Structures are given as C-alpha cells and as structure tokens.
Amino acid sequence: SGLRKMAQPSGLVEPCIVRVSYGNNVLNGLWLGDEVICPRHVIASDTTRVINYENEMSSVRLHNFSVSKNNVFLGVVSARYKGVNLVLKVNQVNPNTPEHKFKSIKAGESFNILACYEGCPGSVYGVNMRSQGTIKGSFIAGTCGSVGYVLENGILYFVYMHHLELGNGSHVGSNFEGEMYGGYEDQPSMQLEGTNVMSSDNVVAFLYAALINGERWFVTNTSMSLESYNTWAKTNSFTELSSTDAFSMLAAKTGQSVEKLLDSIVRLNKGFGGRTILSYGSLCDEFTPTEVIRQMYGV
Amino acid sequence: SGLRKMAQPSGLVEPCIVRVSYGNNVLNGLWLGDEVICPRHVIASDTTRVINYENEMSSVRLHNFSVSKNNVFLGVVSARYKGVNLVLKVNQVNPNTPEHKFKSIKAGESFNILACYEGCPGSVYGVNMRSQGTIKGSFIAGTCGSVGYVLENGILYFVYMHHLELGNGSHVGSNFEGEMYGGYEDQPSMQLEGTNVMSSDNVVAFLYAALINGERWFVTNTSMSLESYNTWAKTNSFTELSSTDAFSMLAAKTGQSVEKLLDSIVRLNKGFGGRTILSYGSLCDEFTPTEVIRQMYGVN
Amino acid sequence: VNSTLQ
Numbered sequence A: 001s002g003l004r005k006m007a008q009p010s011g012l013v014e015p016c017i018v019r020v021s022y023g024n025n026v027l028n029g030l031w032l033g034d035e036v037i038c039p040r041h042v043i044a045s046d047t048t049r050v051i052n053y054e055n056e057m058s059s060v061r062l063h064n065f066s067v068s069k070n071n072v073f074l075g076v077v078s079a080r081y082k083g084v085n086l087v088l089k090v091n092q093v094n095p096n097t098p099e100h101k102f103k104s105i106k107a108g109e110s111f112n113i114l115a116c117y118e119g120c121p122g123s124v125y126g127v128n129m130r131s132q133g134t135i136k137g138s139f140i141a142g143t144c145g146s147v148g149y150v151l152e153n154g155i156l157y158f159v160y161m162h163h164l165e166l167g168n169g170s171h172v173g174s175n176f177e178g179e180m181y182g183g184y185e186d187q188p189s190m191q192l193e194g195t196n197v198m199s200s201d202n203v204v205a206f207l208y209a210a211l212i213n214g215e216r217w218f219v220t221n222t223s224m225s226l227e228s229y230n231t232w233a234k235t236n237s238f239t240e241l242s243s244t245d246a247f248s249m250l251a252a253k254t255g256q257s258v259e260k261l262l263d264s265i266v267r268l269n270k271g272f273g274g275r276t277i278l279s280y281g282s283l284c285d286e287f288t289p290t291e292v293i294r295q296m297y298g299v
Numbered sequence B: 001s002g003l004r005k006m007a008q009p010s011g012l013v014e015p016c017i018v019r020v021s022y023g024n025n026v027l028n029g030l031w032l033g034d035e036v037i038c039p040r041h042v043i044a045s046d047t048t049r050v051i052n053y054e055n056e057m058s059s060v061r062l063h064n065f066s067v068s069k070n071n072v073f074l075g076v077v078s079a080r081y082k083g084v085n086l087v088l089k090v091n092q093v094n095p096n097t098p099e100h101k102f103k104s105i106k107a108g109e110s111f112n113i114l115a116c117y118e119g120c121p122g123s124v125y126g127v128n129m130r131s132q133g134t135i136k137g138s139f140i141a142g143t144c145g146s147v148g149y150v151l152e153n154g155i156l157y158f159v160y161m162h163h164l165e166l167g168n169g170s171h172v173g174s175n176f177e178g179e180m181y182g183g184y185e186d187q188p189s190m191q192l193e194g195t196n197v198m199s200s201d202n203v204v205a206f207l208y209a210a211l212i213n214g215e216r217w218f219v220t221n222t223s224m225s226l227e228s229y230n231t232w233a234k235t236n237s238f239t240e241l242s243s244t245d246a247f248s249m250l251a252a253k254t255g256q257s258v259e260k261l262l263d264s265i266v267r268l269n270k271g272f273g274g275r276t277i278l279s280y281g282s283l284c285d286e287f288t289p290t291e292v293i294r295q296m297y298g299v300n
Numbered sequence C: 001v002n003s004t005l006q
Helices: A053-058 A200-212 A226-233 A245-254 A258-268 A289-296 B053-058 B200-212 B226-235 B245-254 B258-268 B289-293
Strands: A017-022 A025-032 A035-039 A066-069 A072-074 A076-082 A085-090 A110-116 A121-128 A147-152 A155-165 A171-174 B017-022 B025-032 B035-039 B065-068 B076-082 B085-090 B110-117 B120-128 B147-152 B155-165 B171-174
Touching: A017 A035, A025 A066, A025 A155, A035 A155, A053 A076, A110 A155, A200 A245, A200 A258, A200 A289, A226 A258, A245 A289, B017 B035, B017 B120, B025 B155, B035 B155, B053 B076, B065 B076, B065 B085, B110 B155, B200 B245, B200 B258, B200 B289, B226 B258, B245 B289
Parallel strands: none
Antiparallel strands: A017 A025, A017 A066, A025 A035, A035 A085, A066 A072, A076 A085, A110 A121, A110 A147, A147 A155, A155 A171, B017 B025, B017 B065, B025 B035, B035 B085, B076 B085, B110 B120, B110 B147, B147 B155, B155 B171
C-alpha cells in the first residue's frame, strides 16, 4: 500500500548513455547502433545569445567533438541535424544496443527519465507529460540530453530527450523525430510555458489513491455528473473526463463512484483549507489511472 | 526544478533478481555467486496464520523449490535459515554477479528499492528509513523479497530485503545478515510501529531545498542554538542535531545558517496553517543533506 | 489490524 511515484528499471538504457562535449558544452547523448543522438544546442558557441544553427553547423569541425562512454572514446564520422536533435555517426556500433522503438508521449501520460550527468547515469524517476508539452522533472546544469523512456508490452520506447529549462522551472525536451514537445524553440530565449491544463483522469486516480489510504476529509455527500463536470473543466484548466470506465475497480474497492470524486475536484480547486491529500497541499495529476490501479492492489 | 525523490540506476542489481517459489508461494530473491537469498516465509504452508519455522524447515524438500532468473532454472542443493531470510545454495554461479558488500541502513538514511513481481524487476524508487525500522514504500502482493540497495562512491551495497507490511501500512524488511529492521517478527501477528522520530538532519536539509527553490516565507532571521534545539527535539519527537558541519555548503549558498532553520523547525512544527513548503503541507524528513546537495548541485 | 507477510 502507499502511493509513491515510481520508475521502470533503467538497465536497458544505462549502457546507451554517452558523454558528448563540444567547445565549452558538455551534455549527454544516446548511443544506438553506430549513431549518437543529443541536443543540437551542444553545438552552440555562445548559449547566452540567440543561436544561428545554420552557421554553427557550417563551421563545425568533427574533431572538436568528444564522444565517450566510461572514458572510452568513439570517433565521430559525421554530424547532421534532425529537427532539434544532433545525430552523430560514430566509428563504432554500440554492442549493447537494446531492441527498441521510438514514439511520442501525450499529455497526461507517464514515462521514465534516466537523469545523467556528463555521460554518466545518475538517477531514475517517473514524470508526467503536462498539457503544454513540458514536464516537472529535476535537471541541473549538466543533465541536458537525459533520456525519457517507457517499457510497454516487453517493448522499450525512447520518447524524450531533455533540452532546456524554462524561466518558470518547467522542463522542455524533444522526441527522437527531432520535434520539440510543445513546439518550444531551442534557444536561450525567455519563451513562456502557457496555461497548464490539469489531467482530470489523473486527479481522480490520485483521489482514489488517497481514499485507499484512509483519507476521506475531501469526500462530500454530493455528486457531480460527468456532463456537468466536463462543462466546468473546459473553463477551469482541466481536461475532459471521457468516461468512468477506467476507474471501475477503484470505484468498487472504495465505494465512491467517479462522479462523487468529480464533485470533490471542483470543490478542492479553490484550496485545501490548509489540509493535505497524501501529504500534498494541492491536487496532483502526475499519476495515471493505470499507475494507481497497479499500485493499489494486485494488477 | 523542485525537490523530487529519486533512485540510483538499477542496472547492476537487475541481473541478480530471481523468482523463488515453493508450493503455492512465489516471491523475489537475490542471486549472488552460487547463493540465492529471499524471505523465509516462502516455505510456509500458510503465510496467513502463525508459522512454526522450525517445522516448516524440517519438512522442506529441496526439489520442491523453483528458482529461476528468466529461462534459466537453478538447482537448489541446500537450504538454511539466516535470521528471517532463506539462504539457498544453487548449482550455478550467477555470471552477472556485481562487485558488492552488505551493510545496514540507519534511521534517516536513504536507499533504493528495486521492486519486482515474481522474479521480474518492475520498478525502482527511493525511500528513507524511519526511526521504528520501517519505510513508506509501495509494495503489492508479490513484491516480497524486493531488494534495497545503495551506491556510495563506486561501491554497491545490498541493504534491504522486503518481508511484510504492518497493519498500519508501513513496510518492514531485513538486512542481509537476516536481522529484521525494527526487530519485527515475520508473522501475520499484530505488531505496532510506535511513534516515529523525525530526522532533524533531513528536515533542515528539506528547508535548504526550499530556500534554494525560492521559498523563504518561513525564514525568521532569528536563530536557535543547536543546544537549545536538541533539548526541544527530545520532547517533540525529533532527533538531536549532530552539528552543523553537514550543511556548511548549503548555509553558504543560501546565507541562512542552520541555527536559523532550527528556529524555523520549532515554529513550523506547530503547523503550516494554510501555507506550503515545496508544495507539502508539513515538515518532510525523507531527504538527507547529501541527497539535497544533489538535486540542487549534483556534485555527489 | 496488523501484519501481512508479503
């Protein structure tokens, strides 16, 4: 019992992380096959000013790169852009290249981040994609290029690569197709995140998790229909709850139907009155229904 | 980037997790060298009622064990108890046995849990040892035998093996010598946890994390001697502060001395009111100074 | 309430 944010094992990903440096920039790269992918901003000669990527690529000199793993270097044979990603062809194939696939993460979905520091795996933890395409992760100078991944049906998916941190502390990254989630630009600009929309299904999950833990102060003797709720959400920065099917098990186990929890959300949205739910002082939308169900009881 | 609980990579430990079954019991085990360690109740005829471990061991038949990594099934040549753990000798040396040592975790220290379901590594997450020898983790039926580990300066330490869940939801496990943390019995009995003592070290660390994140509404500029704090600590369920040497760097980066945070602790312990710190509604002692120095500066 | 041997 107990609700904790978790991550899937990183063993399959760890061997693919490499240190990539250029000029004064040192970050992390993903080594798969005979290629190394990393943020192209590792090529920038001056990250405190607007970056002209066409010029930076024109003046690039392969020998200036330094790709390595456990202090064993890989020779770079070529460099090209793929969206906001830099793809380096190296003189050696990663013998530990795991079978894998690439896919994009959607808002509300969870995935794992393998936080690395200068080509070295440091920590693993789970995150959740926000509506604007960002995540509330933990990266400090040097974790750029950290990899996001998910294991589903025995298949490893590489889904995210960290690029930058916004002024508001939210984190930005791209998929391996070279597309930046949220369409943010890979510049040291002051772009804004935008209005964050809470994942309604994730909050319901959270509230269910809270119920299973014995917390009930937020449970009223009222209920709000899915239709009414879906109406309210559209104007209060919350997604639309498509159906209650996903919470059937949680509903049976706790005895509270979705709609009752929907009523709670609307009423908790203005403050917890100093109270807490699973130690937090506000609604949490970082756990998907699946995440909660698996962690509650045998699934 | 605020304060989030993390776990160290699990790649070194994954190859050591195995599935151990006996009759209708299935849980996880740890395969190192030619040995496999796992909770001993796996051989219990019925883990639902009180167990006579001597008898269960007297009636155990080696061939009834089932130990497998993946498709590799190991032959059990001998079984013995070592505290609350079962130590099994197998006919094969684990070729992926990493360099390792063993040790116990003290109250207030953190480590990683590699939770597995019937021999399959499913998740990894960080935890912190409470004063009563428990941890607030997340284990579902089948995660028993899950492994706790720490990486301290190139050294991998195996430190925890999951055994049971207390009536109140707290999780209990043992070290690898087979001693149960908190001295709990591996029985479906009714044992209470008791009052937990908050780790002062960790809470002070928590507050530095807050200051580093831009929150300082709780700053008082008024300080409380370490001596006065410790006397207050004893009567309020908090550990006595060793010294302030552990936070030297944090106090420098923030400009707030430990004594000032100690005064903040005493007052904050009366309640946050309608305010929060790092989004929490009360004092958090699950993050150690070392843990916080990283997450904020990552220099290890 | 108490213990479950997981």
